[PDB]
Each structure stands twice: as C-alpha cells, then as structure tokens.
Amino acid sequence: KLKKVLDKLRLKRKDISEAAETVNKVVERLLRRMQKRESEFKGVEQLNTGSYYEHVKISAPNEFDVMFKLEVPRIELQEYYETGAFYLVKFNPLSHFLVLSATKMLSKFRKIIKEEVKEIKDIDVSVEKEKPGSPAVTLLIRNPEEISVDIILALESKGSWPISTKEGLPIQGWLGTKVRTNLRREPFYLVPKNAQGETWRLSFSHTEKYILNNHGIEKTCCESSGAKCCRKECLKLMKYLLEQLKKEFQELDAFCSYHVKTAIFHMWTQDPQDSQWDPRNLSSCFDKLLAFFLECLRTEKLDHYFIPKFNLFSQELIDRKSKEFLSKKIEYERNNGFPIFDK
Template sequence: MNGTERSLAVARIQQKYVERLNTIIELLCNLLKIPYMAFVGSSAEGTDNDESDKDTIWFSDYYDGFDSLTILPDERHPGYSKIQVGYEPKKSELYDYTVEIDDKNYLKNSVKKIIKDRALSHFPSELSSHGAAYTAVVHSIPGESILQIRDSEEVDHVLCIKRPDWPDEAAEWKTRNMHSNWPTDKLVTKITKSGYLLTAVGSKESIESEIQWRVSFNEAELLLIKSFNETQLHCIRLLKLLKKDLSKIAAKNITSYTMKNIMFWCLEKKSNDYWQPSNLMCCFCFCLSELLSCVENEFLSNYFIRKRNLFISREFTCDQRIQTCQYLKRFINDPKTSICLL
C-alpha cells in the first residue's frame, strides 16, 4: 500500500513543479533553436512511484517543411492518422521521408530520425529504439529533485507533432453523455482547446504502419488527472501498483496506460460522492471489475476514441487472457488479503 501514501497536496506540488520545469525547458530549447521537450506521463501527473520510468515528448517542427499538410484519419485503424503533404518539401532532408501512394505524398513516421539527430544528440547516454520511443539509461536528471529518481533509470523520448485542433475521431467525446457529470462542461471545453499530438508510430496491425501516426492526448489526460480528488488519485496509484504484479501474467498487454483509461471510464460511471476515502476499496474493486469485463470481451476502448481497441489481439494470447481474468477474480473476491501483497 506504500504506493498510495502520497497526499493530494504533494501530488499537486509535483504537478506544478513539472509544469514550471517544462516551461523553462521550452524557453531554453527555443534559445538553442532545437525542438523543445516536455516531461509527461506519471511524473507530470503526480502518479509515479519508485519504479516509474520517466517519459518525455519532443515537439517537431518538420511539418513546416511543406507547403501543405492534411491530416487523414485511418478508418481501418481507429486512433491512427496519415499525414498527406505537398510534393515539394522546402528542406531537402525531408525527401527521404515521404512516400508516394496513388499519386499522393505521405510523411513517413521514420522522419523522427531527424529530430533525434537534432535534439537527442545532446544526450550523453546511448539511445535504443523501442516503438515510438528512443530510450536512454541515465544516472541523474538535473533539476528534478522533487521527482522520485533512482541511481539509474530509463527515460523514454517520444517524438510528436502538436496539433492545435481537436481530432474528428474524438468528436463523440465532446458530446458524450457523462452520467456522473465528470468531466465538467468547463473541463471538456478546456481539453478540446488543448489540441492533440500525432506520435511517430504506426499500428502493429497495419501493413501501412510506416505512414501512420498515432493520435495521442497527453495534455488532455493530464488535465483530467489534475481534476482528481484524493481518493481518485490513490485509486489510480493502486491500479498502477497492481499493473506491476499483473504484468508477470499479461506481459505488456496491461500497461499503465491501460489502467489510466480504465480509471477514466470508471469516473464517468460513478458520481463524485462514490469516490470518497471511506470507499477506497470499493472504488478500486469497481475499477478491477471494469478491467475484468474488458479482458473477457477482448476490447478496451481508448477513452477519447471509442473505436480504438487498446488490446492487440495477436499479442494478448488466449492463455494470457484466461490467467489475467483468474488473477482479477481472485483479487476482487478477497481484496483485503490481495492488496497487502502489492
């Protein structure tokens, strides 16, 4: 239960600290004329623990190298888009990162190599590529004293294009009937004005993955978590602790992002009166019941894009799903005993 000991007040301090740190980093990157970065994920949300890795995103300006740019949602793979660009890039280095299909030019997500060479070359640590991220093992992060850090840890650098509008695929979320009145209308408006990101990675289930970009909602998710009360914060931290134990069975099919989406869906279903300190165990078990249902149905909707399944069927094997369901059922049937093992 150590993972829930951090109070809401301490989480708020960390959220504000990382927000200010990101502002300073952006200013410095602008001065150095390199793509700017921001700390995101659990460290920015105040939901990290001793074993959480650090996540950063790097914002690219390479879309400025084209006269025209059109975002085209991929209907066959919800939550992914293609970027159609003009035929003549302004920068010669971009020629190698476009591909022509049916008389149309598309920007390949491998263009992230340019930003890696421009920005991540400043990092002394050796980088390895894992999906959307370049991962570095570091021994310390200057200026991060308030964050939980270890002697050495992995930092994932994810390369993105920032979009100021709200994606058409997530239009349903703006008008969704929230039974619990969460998030509030005011928060929904703020979130839809925060834009979204296109992350340089394609779908594992697509033959066109090299020209796909994943639609991501880092800022929107952060704003949602900043609206959490103390019980909700403890609940998501418990879910992340359980993820660590559950990953021994489900491997990478159950992630921190899985738990975040489960939490968001549960908050829509239960009013704020339900999420109270005296009811923490019930809240936690309710979230586990929702996760169990998703695993049984082999479908977990992305919170903002319903049609996107966060489970990849060919990776989440039948045996893994059965064992995951058995684990969750045992936990729900005896939560007091099970939670002591986290």
C-alpha cells in the same frame, strides 16, 4: 491495509529532488540542441507528460516522459484504414522527411539525441537500443539509481480534432460541456508510433494531464479548501497490481499501465460524483475498479477514451489467452486479500 500499501508506494521528497535535478539537466541540454542548432526541429517546445507529472507515479521517481512538440503549418490527415488512432500525414524544413514519414523524422531526431548524449560528461546517461514501432527515444540515466527518460517526438496541429474523436472524451456529465469544448479547442498531437512506417498515432497526453489534475465534479476536489477524494490512490493501487503481476508473469507482456489509465477514465465517467470516491470508501472503490477491469477483460472490450472505435482489448492486439490469464491472476489476488502487495 490499503492505506499501508499507499504509504509504501509513495515517492520520497528527497528522491524526487535528486532525480528531478538530473533529468532536468539532461532534458534542457537536449532541448537546447534542437533549437540553437539549425536543425529540422527548431521551434520544438517541451511538454511534460505521464504519471510523474500527473502525481500518480508509484514506488520511485525513476521514469519520466517528455514530449518535444513541434508546430506544423497545416494539416492534411488521412485515417489509416478505420483504426481511429493511426493517420497518414500529408501537406520548409521537413522536406528531408518524405507524405511525411514518421520513421525518417524519428531517425533524424534519434540521431541528434545520440550525438548530444555522447557529449554529456557530467551525467552517466546512455541511449537505449531502439524498440521498433515505439515513438520514444529512451535515455537511461544512472546517478546511482536507474532512471529512464522517454523523449517523445510529436506533431502539434491547431485544427479541429479528427472525426474519429467526435464521440470521444465523454466528460459532459462529469467535467461538463464547457470544460469539454475548451479542451477540444486545444491542439491535438501525433506521435511516430507505427503499425506501417509512415503512420503516426494520435496523442492526448496533454488532455489526460489536465483531467488528472482537474478530476472532480466539484471545482474544489482535492484542493486546500475542499474535500479529498481517492481517485488517484485507486489509480495507483491498480497500477501497482499490474506492475507486480507483469513483473512475475511474462504472459502479461502485452498489458501496460495505459490499460489501467483508460479503464479508470471510464470508471470516473460512470461514477462522476466526488462522494462515490470518498476516502473512507477506498476499499469498495478499488474493488469496483477491479470489477470493471474484469468486465473489460471478460468482454475483450476497452475503448480508447478519446477514440471510441479503437478497442485496446481487440483480438488483434491481445490474445484471448493473455486476457483469461490476467483475469484469473487478478480474481485470485482479489479473493485472497492481495498477497502480491506484501512482496
């Protein structure tokens, strides 16, 4: 049943092969351009992020997320109000972008990508119209199949993480205190998402990647000499329910996969043992994930896993009407064996 949905959602080895080679062709060429041209983004290094690289992509290999991280010689951050996740960057190449303005830096970035994309004759690839706010430059590829690639510009800072994350990332009873201390020794990132035009947002896409691939309390969880768990299959099922519901109801435009990602990070923290995620219990795991997500909706409360004061379900960001709509549609599919999965 739920197994059979997971069979349907599984990407195909050939589809992975074909899509990956076209995306890699494009992304390498853009990344060359930022380097072997004396631009403000020389030094930018590639970091792959998102569900395709976390092995939780469903249905088709048709969406890829790539960070072009750029190391910045220190530091000065100022928190935008007390939102937790938005910051003004203050303090050379980047002199053309002044306070370091996200909009002006993104526009140059965007302008380089668009130029280099006009110079692609090998692949059918366009630049999607800019979505205000959003930190991404989105490529639309078409080797028959439609594939979209998000090129995310990011700042890399090696200093300690901002104070708003001090109580974040609570993996101590799950992944433990050494894993946490080491993760927090990694750099943190800032992306040019706005709010207004000078604000950057914290990104922890590199930390979420590690956690998805290091998700057990036992070191052998999901390894060739360990037990398989069903944590990723539960994420996929929950991502699938929201994709089907969003595709049908335009009332759900304000929800996104990151809401599902954040909720299941919390669930994993509350149920740390690998046995609470035994494959033979895929049903009650998916069901307890649903119950948790409904508790989040009912209480209009879903805190950023790394930034606890930042409520992703705050009234300011999603209306109570949108949440009660989602809770009714979800409770429905739940109590009727998920008809939506058969579409």
